[PDB]
Symmetry: D2
Subunit: 380 residues, 4 copies
Amino acid sequence: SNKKTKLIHGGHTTDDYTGAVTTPIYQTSTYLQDDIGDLRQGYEYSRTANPTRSSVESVIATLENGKHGFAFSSGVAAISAVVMLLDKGDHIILNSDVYGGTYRALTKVFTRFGIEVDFVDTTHTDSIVQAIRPTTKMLFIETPSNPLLRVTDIKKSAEIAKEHGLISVVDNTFMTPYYQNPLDLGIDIVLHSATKYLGGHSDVVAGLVATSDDKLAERLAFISNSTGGILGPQDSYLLVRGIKTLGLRMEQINRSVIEIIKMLQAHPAVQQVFHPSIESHLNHDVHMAQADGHTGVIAFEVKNTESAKQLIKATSYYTLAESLGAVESLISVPALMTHASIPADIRAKEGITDGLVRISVGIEDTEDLVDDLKQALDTL
Amino acid sequence: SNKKTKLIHGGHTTDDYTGAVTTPIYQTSTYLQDDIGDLRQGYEYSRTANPTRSSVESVIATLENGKHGFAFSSGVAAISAVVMLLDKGDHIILNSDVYGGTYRALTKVFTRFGIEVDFVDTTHTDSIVQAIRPTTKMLFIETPSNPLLRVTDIKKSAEIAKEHGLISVVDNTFMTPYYQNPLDLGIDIVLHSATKYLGGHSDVVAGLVATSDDKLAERLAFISNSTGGILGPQDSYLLVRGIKTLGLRMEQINRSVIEIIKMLQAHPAVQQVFHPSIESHLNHDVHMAQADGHTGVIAFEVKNTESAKQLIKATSYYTLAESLGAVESLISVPALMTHASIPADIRAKEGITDGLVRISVGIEDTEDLVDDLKQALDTL
Amino acid sequence: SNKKTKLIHGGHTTDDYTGAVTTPIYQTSTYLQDDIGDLRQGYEYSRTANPTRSSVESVIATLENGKHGFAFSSGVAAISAVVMLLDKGDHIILNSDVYGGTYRALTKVFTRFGIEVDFVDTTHTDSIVQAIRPTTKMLFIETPSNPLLRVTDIKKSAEIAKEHGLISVVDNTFMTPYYQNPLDLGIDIVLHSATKYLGGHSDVVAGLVATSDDKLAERLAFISNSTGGILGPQDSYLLVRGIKTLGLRMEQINRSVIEIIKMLQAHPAVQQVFHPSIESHLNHDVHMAQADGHTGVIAFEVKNTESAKQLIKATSYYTLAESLGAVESLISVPALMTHASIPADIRAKEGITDGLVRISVGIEDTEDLVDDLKQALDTL
Amino acid sequence: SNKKTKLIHGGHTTDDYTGAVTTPIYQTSTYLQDDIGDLRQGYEYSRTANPTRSSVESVIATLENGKHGFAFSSGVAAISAVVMLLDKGDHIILNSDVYGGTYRALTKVFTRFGIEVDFVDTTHTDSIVQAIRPTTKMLFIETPSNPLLRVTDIKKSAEIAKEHGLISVVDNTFMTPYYQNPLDLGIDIVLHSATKYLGGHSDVVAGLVATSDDKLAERLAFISNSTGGILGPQDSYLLVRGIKTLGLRMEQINRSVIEIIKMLQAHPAVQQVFHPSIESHLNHDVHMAQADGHTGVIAFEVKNTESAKQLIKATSYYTLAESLGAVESLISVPALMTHASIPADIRAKEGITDGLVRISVGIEDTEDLVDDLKQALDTL
Ligand SMILES: *Cc1c(COP(=O)(O)O)cnc(C)c1O
Ligand SMILES: *Cc1c(COP(=O)(O)O)cnc(C)c1O
Ligand SMILES: *Cc1c(COP(=O)(O)O)cnc(C)c1O
Ligand SMILES: *Cc1c(COP(=O)(O)O)cnc(C)c1O
Ligand code: NA
Ligand code: NA
Ligand code: NA
Ligand code: NA
Ligand code: NA
Ligand code: NA
Ligand code: NA
Ligand code: NA
Ligand code: NA
Ligand code: NA
Ligand code: NA
Ligand code: NA
């Protein structure tokens, strides 16, 4: 019924055999056959299917209102499996602000296989219509984007993809299924770095994919079984466990996001602030119409790299590390860390400047997070 | 010094920090940075590197006498990462009876990416020389192959690859590093389904790759980080643990293999046996020159499908399941299981006859395994 | 600073060596020594100490404002270790409403070792003063109690224990350190079934003990090392992970508790309701003074066993199972399940009747939990 | 049939539900009930029973030819559960060189509970008969003992226990079920530190108990459920896995033991060797009659403390650490490590001399272990 209930009881995460209230961890590679080809419960080889992986796959399918879920060894592995739906000579359109690893995978791996890529400013969806070539087969969107939180109209993107015969993909990592459900808006495939919010505890690297399209699901299952980027059973289990608290965690994070943004907008050492909740933010109305909450990722400008480093050293509760969506609050400078692989001239033009700080708000106390960041900013 | 000692003390499998005699399980996604880019021990994000995965990578590098190891979420994922060393338009030669998953990855995924393939019978290495084009970049061989245990000259394949500028790859799953070391014989890259003997306990799906080539290692590390088919920390740990007993397990398996083959050759219900230890086996001398032991996979032909099925039902200690390299002895009928898509009128041409049985010998008592298979054969 | 921050950053739950932001899982039994008796990080044998166990021990010590923490294989193992502080001939006073397993351990195991036990109604603390014998060495209190939520004044109990030379113990399972901190009120030892709220995810059986008393800590460490009821490293890790979300979970649970109790008090099929938040509940003022929230365990009376069974079968979101403090809402009938080991005549006199239902409120949506239980009660 | 087969196929270590060839890891605390008291597969709460723990319990029962198995959080916890079979005033006889932790549990915990103890030299079983009182209820023996490998007649101890109405217990850690089966010789209860050989990989702390006596099993199950020193599911799984290779590991260890002893007896720097395989060892004939192999623990005397320390520093393949039964060969000096509390002037009386070295032989190559220890001895 309501989302917090669906998080606990949606999907298949109990044991039918013993009645155990959590998913057993099937640390196993193969399964006894009663007769040649007769599988007790449909399992024959864990790369093809594993019951704990099946559990987390059923969870992600349920939460995104899809029919089929797939668990991969990492988010980039989910992305690579989706890109392998295409052949040499196919073209894919992506939004122009994208995760550094997605940029690197597409431009340094898949272009070697003849897959053509254009990064387009999808914050106006008619840009997509101009960018469509006769060879375009896929439209791939992050919203909000990493790290500038650019917002793209999901429903309009889906309509464009349907009209032009494209596979539409949304990377829904930043919003989670708790706040934004691209499949409900006509998107073909939705995917996640489950490394971030879904796992939620900085202890699993994993990717998740969901679709309602039977033929896309069959093609993805074939790719996963043939290239083998599958999530292991222990990580699958820890993902199910982490997902249990996703709603509580996202709601704490959102409460903190609101206050932190107020502080940041008022602070003299802070210039521009990037977050879809700010009403002057481009496509703020689009975000409010396609999501009912916010990501915990915030970007904001300080003067320069050296102020950014001072800010990082003055905080007590923000941890300098990669990733986002942890219970711990994280801080980074994308131009020097996660987005160093994006060329510097494109970084400068897009606004990923040397003094752009990114924070992932965690689930610490709101007043502590605001006060800590504010006194650190006061140090400058 | 000797192999059984190297298995215990090779690689880095203790904790330098606490002194723990086993590798800690780093169930973690990210690592605190003391300053931007300043990593205490070189770790920043578990997809890029994870200390438990690094442990198992050091083990496989040591055991294969290489410099660099890589752990992937499956053997198929290791194979796919190695094939992604190539670009659209490059050509690769493989043995024609290569593992079905390798066949499917190449012909149903990578040919869509413009990679050209020739499948040749490599038991005569001039087959390889005939297939070489100006575009050939890679030579990929299993030895011995499945399920007929065809043997390929590793030293000559390496010489061919060196002379023509190819990256040579050996899938050494069936022999393990305990008996055959392709890198010592001039091969560029060696890889394993660690799902089989290396893990040894039918409880991990995993791939391992080793090389001594710094630039190949740099390229593989880039592919692994960008497409993300990495092995998780729990599975890496179980791999290190399983590998500890690899020599004891392989030696037990080999004693049973020898006695079982003696039984099979004497039995009236058996028309033919396939195993490289048999002196009339093709390239027996080649195998004895490049390996100092044997795989536990044996194939043998009985009268028909129904005799094969009877054999499965009459054994007490042979388990009907997919995979190989378990502690349990496993039994299968390739024409009904792994090769069912190949037609009956055509089966004879490839050698996958209706009465072809494959066993993966486990570590049960030799006398029990011999006696059990023998009395089952006596029921025919 | 504030509790939600302390939950994330309190205790030592990162890796000093690699910087990993979560506690490594030291699946290990022993530790290399650089010289005889020289321990790299103080570890020599995992039963004596294990770094992952040390992590969860530091967490529980921090959260209860103690100096020493101890992790046991179960709550009853924590309780048995604490009872083994006493000798044959010592006497212990417990409150008269206690967990069924605690009753069974004391009356069927430890009385065989000459430890004398009286269960006293501690809801008036002067009862304790009358019950003190010359041999009384320990005072052991649950508050609120299981399953009737009787409340005992912790501070007054501690004053009595100090004045009469008793070791005071509070079983703080139901309140968690998030709402009630017995050590701050003068109690010597605080303990938990970490199986319940602390782990929070129905996937760990564990006990935790905390004290500020150096000599009690030394005696407990000796008992734990000599009788060996230690928590394993994987369970220790899952406990740390679960504890991360304790504040969010308890706050959701408390929001639901308030509404569910309103519904239950208004419902015609429900007679008496047991929960410390109800202002007519005995020692409601005492509870509000020693805790700043509520447990999620509620007991209430329906007509009889058969109405209780009907109620259980009519709910959609309440799971019939043992334990409490899960993310899933649980329902039980204590007289038939957890408290069957308490004799029936004592059950009837104390109010643990055949129609007494116990619910553990989980973290599902409040409106769903209220509506589901209400329509189920309407079925009667 | 034969032992190596029984190790693989004995006990229940597959999943009946999915057919998984390994035991699922039930990381869970509680189980859904279809109706109050109606359990799908007999599970209601993981302290009482857990399916992964039940798997390892069935394994130890099978391997020791018993009916009932019990898994505890440590060997010391198994020992404590067995001792809690007694009441205040009961008397127990143990061999006088019993494991230090057993000595401490009995003399520093259980004597405070009114249990009376005699420590006697059991290498002559009439020692036992002399110590029997009317209050004697239990006889508890290790064979062979640590670190001098004293041998005790199991059959005669069982006859003594039967004649006088005692519960007989054998701590069979050093021999494992692979070589010695006390229950077959009339003993009531057999137990193990599974931390050592059974786990085999220095990565689990665990205890195991087996019996054929239904009423003893009922009493043990009650003690385990009420004091809660249960083994967790992850450790139970790692135990099942490690036990798979127990026979291969013990046989390798035994080959190395034989050759190493040949070396030690010939060496001028060695005054004396302690191991039951030596024909002049006390009760060598008794050991050969009750066991069909040997432990890997060997002790031998060199000149003094400084020669022992030199020996440790000169070895390449012997690791300085606590515990025994690793895949690594371990080396220790009992007078400086396990027996340091015993005074120097008194050391001689017990036989723990200053130059007494203990090694636990691992599964490294026999020639390496012999050569390494020999060249180290040559440095003296
Ligand atoms: C409510 C609920 C659903 C359905 O949720 P929708 O928002 O209607 O898709 C599915 N599963 C569970 C467990 C639920 O509680
Ligand atoms: C013997 C040994 C080696 C070297 O083995 P080679 O086959 O000679 O390369 C490496 N590491 C360890 C731990 C060894 O014992
Ligand atoms: C605030 C805080 C503490 C201290 O909490 P008290 O309530 O003063 O005992 C300890 N550790 C961390 C991480 C904190 O944030
Ligand atoms: C042989 C065998 C047994 C019986 O072993 P005994 O020593 O004769 O009791 C039991 N279980 C399995 C799986 C066996 O192979
Ligand atoms: Na469910
Ligand atoms: Na659709
Ligand atoms: Na090493
Ligand atoms: Na071709
Ligand atoms: Na040619
Ligand atoms: Na080379
Ligand atoms: Na911390
Ligand atoms: Na105090
Ligand atoms: Na079996
Ligand atoms: Na005595
Ligand atoms: Na006497
Ligand atoms: Na008996």
